[PDB]
Write a sequence for this structure.
């Protein structure tokens, strides 16, 4: 989607698109488990 | 090869642009040659054949 707006910015701003271009040039040339449960925040103390 | 042909399109558009610019240069040099031919009186200079 960036290409169109790139044509709006002009030739000077072509540099800032580099990474975008890269992840495009790749596309032409080329289970999970819970994280953040917070159960580690729990505490238990028999001394109480 | 089989690499990305953005090289090919880039070189093609550069070729077309340089063709147009060089052609404008050929108009300029053509007017230069014609005015030299008119001034001298002989066809297309005296150093090269027509």
């Amino acid at each position: 989607d960036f290409i169109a707006e790139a044509n709006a910015k002009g030739w000077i701003m072509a540099g800032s698109y580099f990474f975008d271009l890269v992840k495009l040039n790749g596309s032409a040339t080329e289970d999970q488990f819970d994280t953040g449960t917070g159960l580690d925040k729990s505490s238990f103390d028999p001394t109480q | 090869g089989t690499g990305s042909q953005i090289m090919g399109n880039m070189f093609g558009v550069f070729n077309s642009a340089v063709l147009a610019l060089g052609g404008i240069i050929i108009m300029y040099t053509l007017m230069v040659s014609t005015m030299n031919t008119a001034h001298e009186g002989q066809m297309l200079g005296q150093k090269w054949s027509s």
Summary: The radius of gyration of chain A is 24 Å. DSSP finds two helices and no strands in chain A. Chain A touches chain B at residues 25, 28-29 (CB under 8 Å). Residues 18-29 of chain A form the longest helix (12 residues).
